[PDB]
Each structure stands twice: as C-alpha cells, then as structure tokens.
Amino acid sequence: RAEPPHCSKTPIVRAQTSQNAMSRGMQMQFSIGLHTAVCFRLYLLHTIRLEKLEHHHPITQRYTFGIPEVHASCICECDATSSTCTAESHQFTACPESDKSDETSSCYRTFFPNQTPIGCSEDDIPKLCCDVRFKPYKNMTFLAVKLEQPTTYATFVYAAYDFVNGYWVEKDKTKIRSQLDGGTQDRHLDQKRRISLAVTAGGRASHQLETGMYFSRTSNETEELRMQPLNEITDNNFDRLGWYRMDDSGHFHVNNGVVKMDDIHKAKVKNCKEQTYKSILSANHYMPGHFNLTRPLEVIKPWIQSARIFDSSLRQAVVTHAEGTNLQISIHLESQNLVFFHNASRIRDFSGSIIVDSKSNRLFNLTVYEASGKIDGSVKMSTGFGSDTIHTFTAYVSDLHASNRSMIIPLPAIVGQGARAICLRADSMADIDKICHVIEYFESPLIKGISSIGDGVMIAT
C-alpha cells in the first residue's frame, strides 16, 4: 500500500560550498514547513516530511496522586477524666489495624476536648474523638508533573519510493531527529550515505511552554495534560491537588496525615447524650461534593495540539505545537545532480475560528475537508466576501490522497476583533472553486456535614 506524500512546491536556492587547499561542491537550500513534504530525484524518488515538532518536558518532578472519599465517625465522652477518648488514643495517630477492613482505606484520628456539657452535667467538660477515613474515589489515578521546559527537537520522515509496474514502493524509511536550539545539525539520510540533510532554526519555536505543575489521568498510563491548582512535590496545601498520594505498592495516603489531620479536621459536639456532632474538612479536591476538574490543555489552549506524557517510562512529556514556523534545510552530496518535484492541491470545504488564546496567541484554528497539496487563504476586511484582503496565507497538506486535517494559522495584529470572511482556494484553481465563509472571532484573557454517630455509645455513664 506504499505511497509518497504530497510533494510541495518549494523555491530552491543553489549555494556553493566554501573550499580548502585541495579538490568544488554545491548545496541545495529550501525552507521546509511543519506538516509538509519535499521531493527530489538524484541524477528512486527521495522524500522528506517534517512530521513532528516537540519541546521537551523534563524538569523533574513526578508523583502519582488520587481523589479521596472522606468519612468521619466520632464518639463523645462526658467525663473529662475518662480512659475512653484520650490524647494518647486519638491525637496524632492512625486508627490501628481492623484485620478484615479494606487495604485501600487510610484512616487518621483527631482529639476534640474542652466541650460544652449538652445532654450532660453542668460541671463536667466533655471530649470528642474521631476517625477520619480516606479511600480512592472511582479508582481515579493521576500523575503530577513539573512540566515541559523546552528543548526543541524536529522529527523528520525520510522515505525513498520506486515506481515498479503500475505502483509505488517504499524502499527505505527512516526517522530523522534534529535539535533546533543550537547551530546547524547534519547527518546522512539514505542507506548509500550519498546525501546529507542539514537542519537550522531561525530562532525560538513558534510557541512556548509555561513553567509549573501539570497532571493527566492514568489508566493502570499517560493521557492529555490538564491544569488545576496542584502541589509541588515538597508542598502540602490542602486547597490544591495532590495531598492524597500513591506510594510504590499502590496504597493512597494523606501526605503527612498523622501530623496535619488536626489542622484540617474540625468537629464540635451537638449533644453528648444523643452522640451528635458537627463535622468538616478544611480542604478541597475531596469526595463527596468537593471535586471537579479542569479540561485538558489541548481543549483550552489553541496553540497546543497535544500535551501528553510520552510513554510508560514516565521520563518525558511531549508538547506538540498547533503549528510551528518553517525550518531551514540544505541538501548536499562528491558532485552530481538534484531536481525537485511537486504535486498539486485540492479542497472540498473548510471550517475554523479566529482565536486569541490565554497566552496571547493570535491564530486561525483551520480545519480542511477532503484536501491535499498547497492551499491558499485570503483573510478579508469585513464579513462580506469580496471585501479587502488584510492577510494572505498558504498551508500545505502532506497527504497524497485528499483527507481531513486540522491546523494552526498564525495571524498578524491587523486581523483584529469582530467576525470576518476568509477565502480558501487550492493551487491553480479557478476563482469559481474558491470557498468562502464568515469566520467567528473568539478571545481568551490572561458546607458543614452534621451527623449522629450511628455506631452508638459503648461508654454511656
């Protein structure tokens, strides 16, 4: 089923290599676009596609966490002297092993003395004792990451095709990786080692990464990165995510539960006789009724196509830029001949919206339908088709066969507020075939749960 990608139309600059006190070469220069292909023959058709643009993720931090289901059972002791409900039994301690009860559950004890004698004697000052219980909710698991900090890599796809009796044959197929932050990077591409690919970036890549705490769900296994107030590994804010953390075994616990439990659990006696009390947790991100989540970055951030932990090793996260600037290529060889070829373009329909994202990115979130090759856009003044052109663009769809693709089109500041018309036309298409639509403009800017014990009192009088 071997097939070449749409060979884009690219101007080629002939440069001459400098010389030493020896034996008069030449270099073929061109600017390749992200998600487009370049084709040439050596005088076996050679193709290079700038497939992926990635910023690296690591700096370190990593920790699995969950969402806890909290339940607190208490008991009152009317006589302040009593052996039942004491500082040694309740203050800073986990309720000792039940032997039958769930392994997933995690409990902590808190001591509430100096009570009011309600349903008691006027002189004796009561005391309250509680078991705060925590278990994972819906078995929800997430990795917390201190997230992508850019290093930039380009991923190219080199394929050499041959036309053997009516059909194309993918002879050689490699993945080329080149670091974009330094000077030119050079390597051979073909097995014959005759040709060399030289990649050079103009400056920093189109878009940028924020430094902070991120996370995504785990399926017992990385997913689309989300952003919601989350704790750095060394921090333990109860109003932010990750205070309910998973250790090695898969057991979830409250981060420094023992010690902190008394600062976050607050209970007062309602009536010591009936064994009634007012209870709450001074925290967030717990069940019941204290947990929702932020949508993936992909969804909220137009400049982001995808942001995911790369694999099972959980060492790097890959941020795929919605679109990126072109890269500078030079193809060099001894002394022979190079000819560059190009295919043509087609387009059924399109859809999209003009967006200024939270990180101040002005782009056209374009989606093409049954399209291939070089596609030319024209952003118009007003909603009226035929109004004055304010920007002109060209997108390159790499699929040989007309397919549906989604892309990011950087726009100048002239493409200001309000809805407007945009007209797309493929290459060499008559102005009758030109699709127009009015496109929309969007812009992003920059409690007490009272319960009666239930378990009954074992110590009445």
Side-chain angles (χ1 to χ4, degrees):
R1 57 197 281 250
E3 273 216 314
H6 176 283
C7 304
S8 281
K9 185 178 172 195
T10 340
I12 314 284
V13 170
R14 238 157 192 180
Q16 55 174 335
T17 328
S18 40
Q19 217 179 305
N20 41 27
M22 219 88 199
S23 179
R24 351 267 279 99
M26 263 230 293
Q27 305 219 38
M28 302 308 282
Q29 308 209 313
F30 60 98
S31 173
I32 202 168
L34 166 77
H35 304 122
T36 85
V38 156
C39 302
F40 73 104
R41 275 220 64 126
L42 171 127
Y43 302 148
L44 210 76
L45 154 272
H46 308 294
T47 65
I48 62 139
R49 162 77 150 79
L50 184 45
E51 215 225 320
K52 257 169 277 210
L53 171 52
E54 297 159 343
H55 266 142
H56 253 126
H57 143 59
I59 75 141
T60 171
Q61 301 166 14
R62 274 198 282 122
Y63 76 86
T64 314
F65 70 91
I67 301 310
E69 208 183 287
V70 195
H71 307 272
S73 63
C74 305
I75 38 104
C76 178
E77 235 319 292
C78 249
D79 182 57
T81 81
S82 185
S83 65
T84 57
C85 178
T86 56
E88 220 281 296
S89 58
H90 281 68
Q91 209 180 62
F92 329 121
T93 194
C95 356
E97 330 90 280
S98 162
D99 322 289
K100 277 214 73 65
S101 82
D102 52 335
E103 324 78 81
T104 71
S105 238
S106 171
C107 82
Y108 302 98
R109 286 182 187 158
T110 47
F111 185 69
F112 312 92
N114 308 0
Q115 297 300 331
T116 312
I118 170 135
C120 209
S121 280
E122 296 85 287
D123 284 55
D124 70 336
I125 57 110
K127 57 198 176 175
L128 186 64
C129 287
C130 312
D131 303 67
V132 213
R133 228 168 253 97
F134 307 77
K135 57 179 290 177
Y137 167 87
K138 272 11 250 131
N139 239 11
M140 269 151 48
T141 304
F142 317 73
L143 176 44
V145 294
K146 206 220 176 179
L147 223 203
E148 358 116 30
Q149 343 280 191
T151 80
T152 327
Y153 294 101
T155 298
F156 291 92
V157 165
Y158 171 65
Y161 302 92
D162 210 10
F163 198 73
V164 286
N165 303 80
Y167 330 104
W168 283 112
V169 72
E170 200 171 83
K171 280 240 93 179
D172 182 38
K173 199 207 202 169
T174 57
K175 269 191 166 203
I176 277 93
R177 257 165 276 253
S178 179
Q179 201 225 336
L180 268 26
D181 316 280
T184 307
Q185 297 280 294
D186 197 63
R187 87 241 79 237
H188 298 118
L189 56 155
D190 56 298
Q191 265 279 335
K192 285 188 169 189
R193 311 187 293 106
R194 300 193 289 190
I195 315 117
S196 277
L197 180 62
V199 202
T200 294
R204 207 208 73 180
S206 43
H207 312 121
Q208 85 297 312
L209 331 172
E210 182 180 0
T211 276
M213 281 317 279
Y214 298 93
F215 75 101
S216 86
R217 239 134 30 112
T218 48
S219 180
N220 317 273
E221 212 169 300
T222 138
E223 186 214 86
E224 297 247 296
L225 279 180
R226 303 155 186 271
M227 169 175 76
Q228 187 150 30
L230 171 68
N231 271 306
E232 266 195 68
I233 201 158
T234 70
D235 290 309
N236 227 243
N237 200 317
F238 277 90
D239 304 309
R240 301 180 176 179
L241 285 161
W243 45 262
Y244 195 60
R245 315 204 175 174
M246 201 201 82
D247 55 38
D248 31 277
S249 70
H251 178 66
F252 288 92
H253 74 271
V254 180
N255 205 240
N256 204 42
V258 169
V259 193
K260 290 304 292 160
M261 206 69 243
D262 28 286
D263 299 90
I264 65 139
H265 184 224
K266 284 183 199 88
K268 190 171 84 196
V269 291
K270 188 207 255 157
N271 176 273
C272 199
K273 176 78 185 289
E274 299 162 73
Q275 295 271 295
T276 53
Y277 62 86
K278 307 149 91 157
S279 174
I280 33 81
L281 201 72
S282 223
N284 221 317
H285 306 97
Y286 68 91
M287 282 274 102
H290 281 76
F291 177 79
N292 78 298
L293 223 166
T294 298
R295 288 174 285 151
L297 299 162
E298 290 72 320
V299 174
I300 61 178
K301 280 159 161 249
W303 76 268
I304 302 173
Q305 183 179 300
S306 141
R308 290 191 64 110
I309 302 98
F310 177 80
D311 65 30
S312 67
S313 94
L314 315 160
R315 300 310 301 270
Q316 344 231 247
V318 183
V319 185
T320 296
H321 289 231
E323 277 255 355
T325 66
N326 290 349
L327 293 178
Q328 251 296 320
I329 315 296
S330 96
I331 279 151
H332 63 101
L333 324 130
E334 59 108 78
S335 167
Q336 223 180 331
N337 236 338
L338 304 163
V339 191
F340 294 86
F341 301 99
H342 73 269
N343 309 55
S345 172
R346 49 288 239 177
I347 171 136
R348 201 192 85 90
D349 204 355
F350 79 90
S351 62
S353 28
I354 298 144
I355 281 126
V356 175
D357 72 15
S358 67
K359 293 286 195 130
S360 285
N361 305 312
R362 207 180 288 276
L363 60 264
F364 169 39
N365 191 47
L366 178 61
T367 303
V368 302
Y369 297 103
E370 276 160 65
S372 175
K374 169 187 176 293
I375 284 91
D376 297 12
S378 254
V379 191
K380 268 58 174 63
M381 181 65 80
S382 186
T383 54
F385 308 160
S387 43
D388 322 80
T389 307
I390 62 157
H391 189 69
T392 60
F393 63 94
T394 293
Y396 300 89
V397 183
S398 302
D399 317 291
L400 178 84
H401 294 318
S403 216
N404 305 347
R405 301 278 110 143
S406 184
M407 64 226 69
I408 273 74
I409 325 285
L411 271 12
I414 191 142
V415 193
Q417 281 198 339
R420 66 191 69 242
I422 292 159
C423 298
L424 265 65
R425 169 216 146 240
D427 207 32
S428 286
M429 283 304 108
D431 215 62
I432 293 93
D433 312 301
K434 90 122 120 231
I435 312 113
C436 294
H437 286 343
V438 170
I439 307 297
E440 285 296 318
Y441 179 94
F442 298 95
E443 181 185 318
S444 298
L446 271 54
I447 188 161
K448 234 148 226 285
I450 312 162
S451 65
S452 190
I453 87 148
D455 298 54
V457 85
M458 50 302 142
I459 324 291
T461 60

